[PDB]
mmCIF file of C-alpha atoms in Angstrom:
data_model
loop_
_atom_site.group_PDB
_atom_site.id
_atom_site.type_symbol
_atom_site.label_atom_id
_atom_site.label_comp_id
_atom_site.label_asym_id
_atom_site.label_seq_id
_atom_site.Cartn_x
_atom_site.Cartn_y
_atom_site.Cartn_z
ATOM 1 C CA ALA A 15 148.357 128.463 87.467
ATOM 2 C CA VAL A 16 146.023 130.976 89.159
ATOM 3 C CA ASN A 17 142.943 131.063 86.963
ATOM 4 C CA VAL A 18 141.211 134.307 86.001
ATOM 5 C CA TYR A 19 137.487 134.513 85.309
ATOM 6 C CA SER A 20 135.047 137.233 84.249
ATOM 7 C CA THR A 21 134.089 137.339 87.945
ATOM 8 C CA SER A 22 137.651 137.726 89.229
ATOM 9 C CA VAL A 23 138.729 141.043 90.684
ATOM 10 C CA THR A 24 141.381 142.423 88.354
ATOM 11 C CA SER A 25 143.108 145.650 87.378
ATOM 12 C CA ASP A 26 141.453 147.994 84.886
ATOM 13 C CA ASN A 27 141.503 147.100 81.211
ATOM 14 C CA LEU A 28 144.290 148.681 79.168
ATOM 15 C CA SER A 29 144.062 150.887 76.123
ATOM 16 C CA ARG A 30 145.353 149.377 72.868
ATOM 17 C CA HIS A 31 148.360 151.704 73.179
ATOM 18 C CA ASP A 32 149.242 150.654 76.741
ATOM 19 C CA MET A 33 148.612 146.988 75.928
ATOM 20 C CA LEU A 34 151.049 147.139 73.023
ATOM 21 C CA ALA A 35 153.543 148.929 75.307
ATOM 22 C CA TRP A 36 153.352 146.029 77.751
ATOM 23 C CA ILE A 37 153.934 143.456 75.017
ATOM 24 C CA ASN A 38 156.689 145.377 73.263
ATOM 25 C CA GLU A 39 158.588 146.422 76.349
ATOM 26 C CA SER A 40 158.270 143.070 78.105
ATOM 27 C CA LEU A 41 159.267 140.968 75.086
ATOM 28 C CA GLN A 42 161.437 143.502 73.197
ATOM 29 C CA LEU A 43 159.122 143.414 70.201
ATOM 30 C CA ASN A 44 157.813 146.001 67.784
ATOM 31 C CA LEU A 45 154.107 145.292 67.284
ATOM 32 C CA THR A 46 152.103 148.186 65.871
ATOM 33 C CA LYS A 47 148.591 146.711 66.074
ATOM 34 C CA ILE A 48 146.753 144.427 68.473
ATOM 35 C CA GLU A 49 145.709 142.304 65.466
ATOM 36 C CA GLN A 50 149.326 141.083 65.188
ATOM 37 C CA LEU A 51 148.790 138.969 68.305
ATOM 38 C CA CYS A 52 146.981 136.625 65.893
ATOM 39 C CA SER A 53 150.299 134.799 65.396
ATOM 40 C CA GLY A 54 150.275 133.379 68.940
ATOM 41 C CA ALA A 55 154.047 133.773 69.372
ATOM 42 C CA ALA A 56 153.903 136.528 72.024
ATOM 43 C CA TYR A 57 151.479 134.451 74.123
ATOM 44 C CA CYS A 58 153.803 131.481 73.885
ATOM 45 C CA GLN A 59 156.705 133.598 75.113
ATOM 46 C CA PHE A 60 154.729 135.064 78.002
ATOM 47 C CA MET A 61 153.902 131.512 79.108
ATOM 48 C CA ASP A 62 157.653 130.733 79.036
ATOM 49 C CA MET A 63 158.197 133.802 81.241
ATOM 50 C CA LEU A 64 155.422 132.926 83.660
ATOM 51 C CA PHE A 65 156.139 129.224 83.910
ATOM 52 C CA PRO A 66 159.551 128.279 82.478
ATOM 53 C CA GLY A 67 159.357 124.903 80.735
ATOM 54 C CA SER A 68 155.577 125.079 80.148
ATOM 55 C CA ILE A 69 156.046 125.893 76.431
ATOM 56 C CA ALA A 70 157.939 124.122 73.649
ATOM 57 C CA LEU A 71 159.904 127.299 72.817
ATOM 58 C CA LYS A 72 161.966 125.679 70.046
ATOM 59 C CA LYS A 73 158.759 124.979 68.101
ATOM 60 C CA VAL A 74 157.300 128.487 68.239
ATOM 61 C CA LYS A 75 157.431 130.260 64.890
ATOM 62 C CA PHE A 76 158.414 133.815 65.803
ATOM 63 C CA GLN A 77 158.347 135.121 62.210
ATOM 64 C CA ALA A 78 155.069 133.463 61.200
ATOM 65 C CA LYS A 79 153.237 135.097 58.272
ATOM 66 C CA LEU A 80 150.617 132.488 57.386
ATOM 67 C CA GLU A 81 147.436 131.391 59.167
ATOM 68 C CA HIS A 82 148.382 127.713 59.398
ATOM 69 C CA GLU A 83 151.598 128.756 61.184
ATOM 70 C CA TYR A 84 149.559 130.873 63.634
ATOM 71 C CA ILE A 85 147.469 127.776 64.385
ATOM 72 C CA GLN A 86 150.629 125.805 65.123
ATOM 73 C CA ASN A 87 151.774 128.470 67.613
ATOM 74 C CA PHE A 88 148.331 128.440 69.275
ATOM 75 C CA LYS A 89 148.412 124.656 69.617
ATOM 76 C CA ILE A 90 151.719 125.073 71.483
ATOM 77 C CA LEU A 91 149.985 127.636 73.726
ATOM 78 C CA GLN A 92 147.033 125.301 74.371
ATOM 79 C CA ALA A 93 149.435 122.545 75.387
ATOM 80 C CA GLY A 94 151.035 124.999 77.842
ATOM 81 C CA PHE A 95 147.608 125.913 79.241
ATOM 82 C CA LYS A 96 146.845 122.200 79.730
ATOM 83 C CA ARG A 97 150.201 121.568 81.437
ATOM 84 C CA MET A 98 149.529 124.396 83.905
ATOM 85 C CA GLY A 99 145.860 123.723 84.609
ATOM 86 C CA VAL A 100 144.637 126.883 82.892
ATOM 87 C CA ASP A 101 140.816 126.761 82.639
ATOM 88 C CA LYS A 102 140.485 129.153 79.733
ATOM 89 C CA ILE A 103 139.312 128.046 76.296
ATOM 90 C CA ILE A 104 141.357 129.814 73.593
ATOM 91 C CA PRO A 105 139.206 130.776 70.580
ATOM 92 C CA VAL A 106 142.066 129.886 68.204
ATOM 93 C CA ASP A 107 139.942 129.719 65.061
ATOM 94 C CA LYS A 108 138.807 133.313 65.605
ATOM 95 C CA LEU A 109 142.104 134.817 66.747
ATOM 96 C CA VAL A 110 144.222 133.658 63.829
ATOM 97 C CA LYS A 111 141.974 135.582 61.391
ATOM 98 C CA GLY A 112 143.470 138.836 62.696
ATOM 99 C CA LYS A 113 140.294 140.697 63.590
ATOM 100 C CA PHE A 114 140.764 143.445 66.139
ATOM 101 C CA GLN A 115 137.758 142.770 68.367
ATOM 102 C CA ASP A 116 138.455 139.064 69.040
ATOM 103 C CA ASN A 117 142.181 139.675 69.518
ATOM 104 C CA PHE A 118 141.649 142.622 71.850
ATOM 105 C CA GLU A 119 139.131 140.683 73.976
ATOM 106 C CA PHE A 120 141.571 137.767 74.398
ATOM 107 C CA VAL A 121 144.592 139.944 75.192
ATOM 108 C CA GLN A 122 142.631 141.788 77.881
ATOM 109 C CA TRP A 123 142.003 138.448 79.564
ATOM 110 C CA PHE A 124 145.566 137.269 78.984
ATOM 111 C CA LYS A 125 147.086 140.351 80.618
ATOM 112 C CA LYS A 126 144.908 139.746 83.714
ATOM 113 C CA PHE A 127 146.023 136.127 83.708
ATOM 114 C CA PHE A 128 149.639 137.249 83.377
ATOM 115 C CA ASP A 129 149.358 139.758 86.207
ATOM 116 C CA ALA A 130 147.773 137.122 88.489
ATOM 117 C CA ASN A 131 150.646 134.717 87.881
ATOM 118 C CA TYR A 132 153.842 136.719 87.301
ATOM 119 C CA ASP A 133 156.397 136.327 90.098
ATOM 120 C CA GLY A 134 158.740 139.148 89.008
ATOM 121 C CA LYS A 135 161.518 136.851 87.744
ATOM 122 C CA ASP A 136 164.115 138.367 85.481
ATOM 123 C CA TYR A 137 163.666 137.400 81.847
ATOM 124 C CA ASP A 138 165.673 138.083 78.721
ATOM 125 C CA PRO A 139 163.194 137.665 75.857
ATOM 126 C CA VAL A 140 165.865 138.107 73.171
ATOM 127 C CA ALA A 141 168.152 135.487 74.782
ATOM 128 C CA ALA A 142 165.104 133.200 75.084
ATOM 129 C CA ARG A 143 164.398 133.495 71.343
ATOM 130 C CA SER B 14 143.137 186.541 64.116
ATOM 131 C CA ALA B 15 144.712 183.768 66.123
ATOM 132 C CA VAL B 16 148.196 183.717 67.623
ATOM 133 C CA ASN B 17 149.897 180.763 66.007
ATOM 134 C CA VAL B 18 151.973 178.271 67.980
ATOM 135 C CA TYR B 19 154.914 176.392 66.466
ATOM 136 C CA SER B 20 157.423 173.789 67.677
ATOM 137 C CA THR B 21 159.826 176.748 68.036
ATOM 138 C CA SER B 22 157.432 178.810 70.173
ATOM 139 C CA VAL B 23 158.199 179.233 73.838
ATOM 140 C CA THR B 24 155.366 177.582 75.734
ATOM 141 C CA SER B 25 154.467 176.058 79.057
ATOM 142 C CA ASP B 26 155.648 172.542 79.865
ATOM 143 C CA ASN B 27 153.824 169.565 78.370
ATOM 144 C CA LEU B 28 151.113 167.969 80.506
ATOM 145 C CA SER B 29 150.830 164.354 81.570
ATOM 146 C CA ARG B 30 147.807 162.472 80.273
ATOM 147 C CA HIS B 31 146.024 162.850 83.598
ATOM 148 C CA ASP B 32 146.691 166.576 83.859
ATOM 149 C CA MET B 33 145.556 167.068 80.252
ATOM 150 C CA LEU B 34 142.262 165.247 80.885
ATOM 151 C CA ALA B 35 141.654 167.339 83.996
ATOM 152 C CA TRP B 36 142.046 170.500 81.917
ATOM 153 C CA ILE B 37 139.567 169.309 79.277
ATOM 154 C CA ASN B 38 137.130 167.950 81.852
ATOM 155 C CA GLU B 39 137.092 170.990 84.135
ATOM 156 C CA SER B 40 137.057 173.573 81.335
ATOM 157 C CA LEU B 41 134.266 171.976 79.321
ATOM 158 C CA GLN B 42 132.534 170.119 82.187
ATOM 159 C CA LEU B 43 133.087 166.714 80.595
ATOM 160 C CA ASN B 44 133.920 163.244 81.885
ATOM 161 C CA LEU B 45 136.564 161.906 79.513
ATOM 162 C CA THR B 46 138.625 159.027 80.883
ATOM 163 C CA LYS B 47 141.084 158.652 78.015
ATOM 164 C CA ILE B 48 143.014 160.934 75.672
ATOM 165 C CA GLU B 49 141.857 158.677 72.803
ATOM 166 C CA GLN B 50 138.310 160.053 73.382
ATOM 167 C CA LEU B 51 139.391 163.350 71.799
ATOM 168 C CA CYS B 52 138.976 161.431 68.511
ATOM 169 C CA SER B 53 135.458 162.833 68.277
ATOM 170 C CA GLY B 54 136.583 166.414 67.647
ATOM 171 C CA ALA B 55 133.738 167.849 69.729
ATOM 172 C CA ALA B 56 135.936 169.190 72.559
ATOM 173 C CA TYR B 57 138.213 170.999 70.084
ATOM 174 C CA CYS B 58 135.204 172.568 68.403
ATOM 175 C CA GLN B 59 133.924 173.849 71.755
ATOM 176 C CA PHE B 60 137.322 175.198 72.716
ATOM 177 C CA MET B 61 137.294 177.214 69.478
ATOM 178 C CA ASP B 62 133.854 178.570 70.386
ATOM 179 C CA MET B 63 135.333 179.628 73.765
ATOM 180 C CA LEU B 64 138.460 181.177 72.258
ATOM 181 C CA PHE B 65 136.834 182.924 69.308
ATOM 182 C CA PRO B 66 133.028 183.072 69.651
ATOM 183 C CA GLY B 67 131.463 182.701 66.212
ATOM 184 C CA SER B 68 134.503 180.922 64.716
ATOM 185 C CA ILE B 69 132.695 177.535 64.848
ATOM 186 C CA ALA B 70 129.307 176.348 63.568
ATOM 187 C CA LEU B 71 128.395 175.240 67.102
ATOM 188 C CA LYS B 72 124.868 174.111 66.152
ATOM 189 C CA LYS B 73 126.372 171.559 63.736
ATOM 190 C CA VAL B 74 128.773 169.920 66.224
ATOM 191 C CA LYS B 75 127.881 166.347 67.168
ATOM 192 C CA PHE B 76 128.480 166.190 70.912
ATOM 193 C CA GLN B 77 127.139 162.642 71.192
ATOM 194 C CA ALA B 78 129.099 161.326 68.202
ATOM 195 C CA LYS B 79 129.705 157.565 68.366
ATOM 196 C CA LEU B 80 130.734 156.789 64.782
ATOM 197 C CA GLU B 81 133.846 157.689 62.801
ATOM 198 C CA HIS B 82 132.023 159.636 60.057
ATOM 199 C CA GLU B 83 130.530 161.964 62.682
ATOM 200 C CA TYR B 84 134.008 162.467 64.158
ATOM 201 C CA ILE B 85 135.163 163.539 60.697
ATOM 202 C CA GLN B 86 132.260 165.957 60.396
ATOM 203 C CA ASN B 87 133.316 167.570 63.721
ATOM 204 C CA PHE B 88 136.904 167.841 62.513
ATOM 205 C CA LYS B 89 135.786 169.491 59.287
ATOM 206 C CA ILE B 90 133.958 172.054 61.465
ATOM 207 C CA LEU B 91 137.244 172.543 63.323
ATOM 208 C CA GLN B 92 139.237 172.942 60.123
ATOM 209 C CA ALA B 93 136.784 175.578 58.963
ATOM 210 C CA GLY B 94 137.295 177.408 62.284
ATOM 211 C CA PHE B 95 141.066 177.226 61.885
ATOM 212 C CA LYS B 96 140.784 178.651 58.351
ATOM 213 C CA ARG B 97 138.525 181.497 59.496
ATOM 214 C CA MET B 98 140.963 182.460 62.272
ATOM 215 C CA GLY B 99 144.170 182.122 60.266
ATOM 216 C CA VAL B 100 145.449 179.132 62.269
ATOM 217 C CA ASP B 101 148.460 177.687 60.363
ATOM 218 C CA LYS B 102 148.312 174.188 61.899
ATOM 219 C CA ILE B 103 147.526 171.184 59.734
ATOM 220 C CA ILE B 104 145.094 168.841 61.552
ATOM 221 C CA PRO B 105 145.908 165.130 60.953
ATOM 222 C CA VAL B 106 142.221 164.184 60.861
ATOM 223 C CA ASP B 107 142.641 160.620 59.573
ATOM 224 C CA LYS B 108 145.081 159.808 62.392
ATOM 225 C CA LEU B 109 142.933 161.405 65.061
ATOM 226 C CA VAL B 110 139.508 159.953 64.350
ATOM 227 C CA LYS B 111 140.776 156.360 64.684
ATOM 228 C CA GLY B 112 141.485 157.066 68.349
ATOM 229 C CA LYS B 113 145.234 156.410 68.080
ATOM 230 C CA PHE B 114 146.891 157.488 71.334
ATOM 231 C CA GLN B 115 150.173 158.918 70.097
ATOM 232 C CA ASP B 116 148.562 161.084 67.438
ATOM 233 C CA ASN B 117 145.796 162.279 69.717
ATOM 234 C CA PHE B 118 148.263 163.018 72.540
ATOM 235 C CA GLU B 119 150.628 164.928 70.238
ATOM 236 C CA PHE B 120 147.745 167.003 68.843
ATOM 237 C CA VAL B 121 146.203 167.859 72.213
ATOM 238 C CA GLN B 122 149.618 168.950 73.569
ATOM 239 C CA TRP B 123 149.839 171.419 70.687
ATOM 240 C CA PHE B 124 146.218 172.422 71.086
ATOM 241 C CA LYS B 125 146.576 173.309 74.770
ATOM 242 C CA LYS B 126 149.564 175.534 73.908
ATOM 243 C CA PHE B 127 147.492 177.133 71.151
ATOM 244 C CA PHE B 128 144.633 177.605 73.600
ATOM 245 C CA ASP B 129 146.860 179.198 76.228
ATOM 246 C CA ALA B 130 148.363 181.601 73.654
ATOM 247 C CA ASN B 131 144.892 182.775 72.652
ATOM 248 C CA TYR B 132 142.572 182.608 75.677
ATOM 249 C CA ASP B 133 141.454 186.062 76.859
ATOM 250 C CA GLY B 134 139.858 184.968 80.162
ATOM 251 C CA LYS B 135 136.236 185.501 79.065
ATOM 252 C CA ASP B 136 133.492 183.851 81.103
ATOM 253 C CA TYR B 137 132.235 180.682 79.464
ATOM 254 C CA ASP B 138 129.527 178.260 80.505
ATOM 255 C CA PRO B 139 130.275 175.094 78.470
ATOM 256 C CA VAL B 140 127.075 173.278 79.529
ATOM 257 C CA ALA B 141 124.851 176.240 78.601
ATOM 258 C CA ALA B 142 126.768 176.392 75.302
ATOM 259 C CA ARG B 143 125.921 172.743 74.470
ATOM 260 C CA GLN B 144 122.194 173.295 75.230
#
């Protein structure tokens, strides 16, 4: 993977509205709040899109409702990060609590990471699920 | 009294977000970068002062508002202006002050149409007004 740091030159940050548009349009989802990224499932799917085979897709819990399930999804994501040489520590313990500030900070970074690595490949996120 | 604007009124075309910010910024001499920043209610209050001088308690508007409760105070000033001028529009204050884009964009589209139906072309110095 191409790593993204606080010192990297990136595009402007997105509003919460435009960030949710990116997630929902790219993955054919229906999130209404950034806090919902606490489940880790969308991140797992974006890793599948970026680097097919990096993520254990069959193990991701796409309808997770409980914190321990969120943690399972994030452990899948961490394993994908390790596989791809991603030098970002994921603050899993914080994210899964569903607080806006922590989740918004991480998604801003993740979108920059995504944009640095996406090759434009076609992807059917419904078919993938 | 104000000319009211409804979904059935014939109006100008809607503006893009960038064109809407340019209107607010140029007219009030502000530097907003996002539609969501209209959550503070201050720009709407000043527009009412421009449209109908004396309609708004201008001295009570919080132009440097940073916290939600101050946003609500500005919107209550606006609601009082609307009542004074016979404006029939319900302001969705709770939705606006949270900075939600869709709600703020929908409201400002209406507000610009309302403004254009009512503006008489008077001179207005928005900086001098805020001082």
